[PDB]
Design an enzyme around this catalytic site. Sequence first.
Site, PDB file in Angstrom:
ATOM      1  N   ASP A  75      33.738 -43.613  13.393  1.00 13.45           N
ATOM      2  CA  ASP A  75      34.308 -42.581  13.872  1.00 13.45           C
ATOM      3  C   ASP A  75      35.735 -42.870  14.374  1.00 13.45           C
ATOM      4  O   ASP A  75      36.227 -42.620  15.478  1.00 13.45           O
ATOM      5  CB  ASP A  75      33.710 -41.512  15.147  1.00 13.45           C
ATOM      6  CG  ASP A  75      34.156 -40.325  15.029  1.00 13.45           C
ATOM      7  OD1 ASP A  75      34.731 -39.747  14.271  1.00 13.45           O
ATOM      8  OD2 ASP A  75      33.682 -39.602  15.767  1.00 13.45           O
ATOM      9  N   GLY A  88      32.311 -31.525  27.564  1.00 12.82           N
ATOM     10  CA  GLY A  88      32.018 -30.612  28.378  1.00 12.82           C
ATOM     11  C   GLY A  88      30.532 -29.974  27.949  1.00 12.82           C
ATOM     12  O   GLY A  88      29.264 -30.563  28.232  1.00 12.82           O
ATOM     13  N   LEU A 139      37.185 -35.332  33.497  1.00 11.85           N
ATOM     14  CA  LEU A 139      38.349 -36.040  32.626  1.00 11.85           C
ATOM     15  C   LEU A 139      38.468 -35.309  31.073  1.00 11.85           C
ATOM     16  O   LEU A 139      39.744 -35.087  30.733  1.00 11.85           O
ATOM     17  CB  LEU A 139      37.950 -37.396  32.308  1.00 11.85           C
ATOM     18  CG  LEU A 139      38.513 -38.475  33.364  1.00 11.85           C
ATOM     19  CD1 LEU A 139      38.070 -39.955  33.032  1.00 11.85           C
ATOM     20  CD2 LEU A 139      39.808 -38.413  34.125  1.00 11.85           C
TER      21      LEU A 139
HETATM   22  C1  LIG Z   1      40.927 -37.109  25.006  1.00  9.03           C
HETATM   23  C2  LIG Z   1      40.452 -37.030  26.332  1.00  9.03           C
HETATM   24  C3  LIG Z   1      39.853 -38.400  26.756  1.00  9.03           C
HETATM   25  O1  LIG Z   1      39.476 -39.184  25.841  1.00  9.03           O
HETATM   26  N1  LIG Z   1      40.109 -38.768  28.102  1.00  9.03           N
HETATM   27  C4  LIG Z   1      39.761 -39.984  28.841  1.00  9.03           C
HETATM   28  C5  LIG Z   1      40.627 -40.381  29.767  1.00  9.03           C
HETATM   29  C6  LIG Z   1      40.027 -41.482  30.217  1.00  9.03           C
HETATM   30  C7  LIG Z   1      39.097 -42.251  30.201  1.00  9.03           C
HETATM   31  N2  LIG Z   1      38.710 -43.449  30.705  1.00  9.03           N
HETATM   32  C8  LIG Z   1      37.693 -44.061  30.470  1.00  9.03           C
HETATM   33  N3  LIG Z   1      36.716 -43.648  29.153  1.00  9.03           N
HETATM   34  C9  LIG Z   1      36.984 -42.544  28.847  1.00  9.03           C
HETATM   35  N4  LIG Z   1      36.150 -42.029  27.653  1.00  9.03           N
HETATM   36  C10 LIG Z   1      35.034 -42.281  27.761  1.00  9.03           C
HETATM   37  C11 LIG Z   1      34.399 -42.616  26.369  1.00  9.03           C
HETATM   38  C12 LIG Z   1      33.178 -43.134  26.033  1.00  9.03           C
HETATM   39  C13 LIG Z   1      32.465 -43.526  27.193  1.00  9.03           C
HETATM   40  C14 LIG Z   1      32.690 -43.578  28.527  1.00  9.03           C
HETATM   41 BR1  LIG Z   1      31.881 -43.899  29.883  1.00  9.03          BR
HETATM   42  C15 LIG Z   1      34.021 -42.890  28.562  1.00  9.03           C
HETATM   43  C16 LIG Z   1      38.073 -41.753  29.010  1.00  9.03           C
HETATM   44  C17 LIG Z   1      38.482 -40.563  28.448  1.00  9.03           C
HETATM   45  C18 LIG Z   1      39.964 -36.954  23.986  1.00  9.03           C
HETATM   46  N5  LIG Z   1      40.195 -35.861  22.992  1.00  9.03           N
HETATM   47  C19 LIG Z   1      39.147 -35.682  21.916  1.00  9.03           C
HETATM   48  C20 LIG Z   1      41.503 -36.153  21.969  1.00  9.03           C
END
Ligand SMILES: */C(=C/C(=O)Nc1ccc2ncnc(Nc3cccc(Br)c3)c2c1)CN(C)C
Length: 251
Positions: free
Chosen positions: A118, A20, A17
């Site tokens: 944040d 990295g 997603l």
């Molecule tokens: C932009 C990309 C991003 O945040 N993608 C992303 C897409 C879908 C998604 N679904 C669920 N959860 C997450 N992130 C996530 C965050 C914290 C814990 C967990 Br487990 C999952 C997610 C993320 C980010 N750039 C920095 C703008």
Amino acid sequence: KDAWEIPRESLRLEVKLGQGFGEVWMGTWNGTTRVAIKTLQEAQVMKKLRHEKLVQLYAVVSEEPIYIVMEYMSKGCLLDFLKGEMGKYLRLPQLVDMAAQIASGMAYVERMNYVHRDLRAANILVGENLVCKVADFGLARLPIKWTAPEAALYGRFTIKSDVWSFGILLTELTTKGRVPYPGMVNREVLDQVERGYRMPCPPECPESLHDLMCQCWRKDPEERPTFEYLQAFLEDYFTSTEPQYQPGENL
Ligand SMILES: */C(=C/C(=O)Nc1ccc2ncnc(Nc3cccc(Br)c3)c2c1)CN(C)C
């Protein structure tokens, strides 16, 4: 190991997603449940916080390598959404509604006596129907272009420094995701904000919304509005505040 614990075998990692701390994957859970998985706390934390406008914890894997399992947000992070194909059609009503949802999630955080630390568009996740939820409590308790002066300078992170970051998120929204303080570098922003410099009205953003921003950026933490004030103001915006709103080229 508490009752949030699950077996790894119950998780199917699928698509990245997601870069990295480590990756972020879309996934399945007990064969039936679409989830998001954070590979290597936020979980801990996300165990004690439960709100409709906060991305929900589902399960944790103790257990090196450590997985965190969460509600899947179908539209990805807000910054990306704002700056991509959708950015172009988002107008002020939709952007203010998104702001209200983030305020609502943050109002809960405020009621619970927590601090995010944040809060910015990179940490807001979008789902279907333009739903927005607070994510990434990696630093939640208990980057300086979004960080209030007292917090960047003296490590005084509070719900009031979150409000500050909220003002900056309001500029990301009204500008379709542009980096705040355009052309200024971190050190320039530090020096100028300390002198009393505040971003000007974004083009086409009404003065009453920028007014709200400027409240969020008061030098004095205790003078910044509550998130519950912010929520109610943004919820009621187009009746109580801008009843004569007419659409424009961009907002
Ligand atoms: C932009 C990309 C991003 O945040 N993608 C992303 C897409 C879908 C998604 N679904 C669920 N959860 C997450 N992130 C996530 C965050 C914290 C814990 C967990 Br487990 C999952 C997610 C993320 C980010 N750039 C920095 C703008």
